[PDB]
Design a protein around this nucleic acid. Structure first.
Lengths: 25, 202, 72, 102, 118, 61
RNA sequence: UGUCCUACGCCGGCAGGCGCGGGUAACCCGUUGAACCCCAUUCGUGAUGGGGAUCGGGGAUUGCAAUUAUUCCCCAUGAACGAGGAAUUCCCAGUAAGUGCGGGUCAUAAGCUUGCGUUGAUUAAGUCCCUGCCCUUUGUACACACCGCCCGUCGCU
């Protein structure tokens, strides 16, 4: 839709990105 | 990392940083040899000193090099702290305080030469919303072209960090009517690589 | 600039340290050497002499720092 | 010096030397400007700690002034909010340049 | 402030370009600083410098004893060039003010360098 | 005037290098005001935030 | 790790010698007694008791041979160096950094690479802005390419 496009351009993408970094006996 | 990331030149180069700046013999050596290269760069007539606009002199070490050979100059600066440091060094040339981007306030056909020491790579970024970098560079270049004698020589020492900054400064210079080019000191080197805008009127 | 701290206690500065070290509210060799324009070795020797006189109380002992306080 | 618990002076120095607003750098092609952004309280504490560290380190660095008493003086002057602290001056410059780059 | 520096000064306002020159002067204390005497230098301001601006700047500086015309020569006059050197390069107005004709913006020279802040 | 605010949820991080965090924040003097603001550094839900001026809403691409 | 590792006794302050043992190896060096750190003194903002370069002399060690100072110990002078315009390297937990300790190269150097633990933090749990690589679509912008001008004026043989 038009308003969805306008609000997607008005907001910032976020969400998923897997960043792989980095006892008993 | 770099002095340009610290902030505006009026407030970054304060009392204590100028105090530790003047006590640096490495700075003395690099400034004297760049001043010598800049004085050798322009083809001024021998046995006849020229009227040089010294912009970005600051402490006036390049101005001290000019005064050591019998030449005369006037200094334009933006920070009062290192201006007072230059005053305390019993310097001979005159000093002016103001923003070079707002325009050089001198009559046309006055200066036979221009010496810029680490002042053109400063102005590429903006530290205020009211300051437009393209407008500021265009106004500074147009005022410098106005105040210069037709046929005078202008040298500008710089250390650009990418090719886009050089692209903007060169396109502002070539839209301001300056005729000239770029001279690099040891382009394939890293420590000894310097950049030098050379300009003239006609 | 170039400091000119004295190498031995003259009569006048000895008089001010006689009548003034009981009242600074803080005692360390650093500020004593700074404000009296005296050698720091003489400052620490003077405070060992003065604690031998016992008119300034100890707080803590360390090789690099010594700290002292008033009697009242 | 202050006659009471040094922890209160320390937390007052932490509170008073926290940069509440500063500038971020943005730019697409050569033209780089600064936008006035806000600092999280955790980063406020972190920058206050780092600024007191820089003040204590580069305060004297070349004379009889001991690092312990220099740190004590810096913490006391930051808790009092005086302009003698390097941390307070740097913080105030940070909010002022944030206000200059709204 | 050397007299040649303000004698070549203009106003940096956009609207006054380029008829803002010259600028008026006001002095409360004047210093004399020794400057090396270059005879070629003093010889080759005189065709270039504006003489009427020099007279009006001297009139704002309370001083009258100057020659009324541009003295052109082959450096054979020692005392005229010496007086010009003393007036231009050695006279310094450390404390003072500058005023623009068409904008009225003030510039306070306060120990000892004029500001140009917008 | 300096004012204190409380966040509700994070909208997401913004900036060219992802240096700032755009976050939804609201007020205690009235529980009706709601603004969007950018705060850099580590920001999680629960912290109390500080506004030097409550005039404009922060907005970046 | 070892028939070069050395325990111990004698001599010379040290560089090093002499003598007698242990070891072909978790047995002897070796409860592998190390450095940083810790406590106390002296020093005290001083190109200074910092830093040690570059020198002179003596002695000893290693070897056919040491001069172009192989190497070590001592003594004597004490240069730059006052935190580095500007380009750039590495990095997220026992990690970086400080700190010392072994193996290969060795008649004798000390200087490269590999390891070792000890003291052990700040910053972030991120982004595609710069760099590089790989995907999806495309060859529509610009460049290449086509067309046009292909610098004009006078003067003699």
């Amino acid at each position: 839709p038009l308003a969805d496009q306008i609000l997607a351009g008005n907001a910032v993408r976020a969400g998923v990105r897997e960043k792989r970094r980095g006892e008993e006996y | 990392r770099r002095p340009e990331h610290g902030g505006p030149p009026e407030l970054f180069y304060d009392e204590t940083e100028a105090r530790k700046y003047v006590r640096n013999s490495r700075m003395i050596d690099i400034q004297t040899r760049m001043a010598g290269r800049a004085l050798e760069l322009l083809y001024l007539p021998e046995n006849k000193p020229c009227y040089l606009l010294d912009i970005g002199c600051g402490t006036g070490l390049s101005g001290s090099y000019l005064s050591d050979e019998g030449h005369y100059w006037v200094g334009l600066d933006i920070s009062p702290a290192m201006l007072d440091e230059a005053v305390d060094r019993e310097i001979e040339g005159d000093l002016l305080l103001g923003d070079m981007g707002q325009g050089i306030p001198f009559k046309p056909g006055t200066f036979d030469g221009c010496i810029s020491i680490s002042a053109v790579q400063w102005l590429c970024n903006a530290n205020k919303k009211s300051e437009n970098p393209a407008k500021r560079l265009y106004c500074f270049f147009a005022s410098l072209f106005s105040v210069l004698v037709r046929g005078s020589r202008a040298v500008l020492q710089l250390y650009p960090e990418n090719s886009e900054q050089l692209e903007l400064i060169t396109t502002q210079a070539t839209k301001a009517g300056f005729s000239g080019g770029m001279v690099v000191d040891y382009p394939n080197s890293a420590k000894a690589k310097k950049f030098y805008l050379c300009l003239f009127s006609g | 600039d170039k400091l000119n701290n004295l190498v031995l206690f003259d009569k006048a500065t000895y008089d001010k340290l006689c009548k003034e070290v009981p009242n600074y509210k803080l005692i360390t060799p650093a500020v004593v050497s700074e404000r009296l324009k005296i050698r720091g070795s003489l400052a620490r020797a003077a405070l060992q002499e003065l604690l031998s006189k016992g008119l300034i109380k100890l707080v803590s002992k360390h090789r690099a720092q010594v700290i002292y306080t008033r009697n009242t | 010096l202050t006659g009471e618990n040094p922890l209160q002076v320390l937390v007052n120095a932490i509170i008073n030397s926290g940069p509440r607003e500063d500038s971020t750098r943005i730019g697409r092609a050569g033209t780089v400007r600064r936008q006035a952004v806000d600092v999280s309280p955790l980063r406020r504490v972190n920058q206050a700690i780092w600024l007191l560290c820089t003040g204590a380190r580069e305060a004297a660095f070349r004379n009889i002034k001991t690092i312990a008493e220099c740190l004590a003086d810096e913490l006391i002057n930051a808790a009092k909010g005086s302009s003698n602290s390097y941390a307070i001056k740097k913080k105030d410059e940070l909010e002022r340049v944030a206000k200059s780059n709204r | 402030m050397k007299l040649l520096t303000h004698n070549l000064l203009s106003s940096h306002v956009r609207g006054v370009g380029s008829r803002g020159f010259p600028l008026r002067l006001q002095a409360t204390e004047v210093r004399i600083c020794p400057v090396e005497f270059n005879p070629n230098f003093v010889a080759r301001m005189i065709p270039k410098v504006e003489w009427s601006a020099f007279l009006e700047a001297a009139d704002n500086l309370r001083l009258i004893q100057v020659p009324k015309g541009p003295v052109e020569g082959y450096e054979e006059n020692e005392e005229f060039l010496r007086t010009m050197h003393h007036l231009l390069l050695e006279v310094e107005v450390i404390e003072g003010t500058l005023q623009c004709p068409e904008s009225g913006r003030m510039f306070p020279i306060s120990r000892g360098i004029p500001n140009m802040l917008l | 005037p300096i004012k204190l605010a409380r966040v509700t949820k994070v909208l997401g991080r913004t900036g060219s290098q992802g240096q700032c965090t755009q976050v939804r924040v609201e007020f205690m003097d009235d529980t009706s005001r709601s603004i969007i603001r950018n705060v850099k550094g580590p920001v999680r839900e629960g912290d109390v935030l500080t506004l030097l001026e409550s005039e404009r809403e922060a907005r970046r691409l």
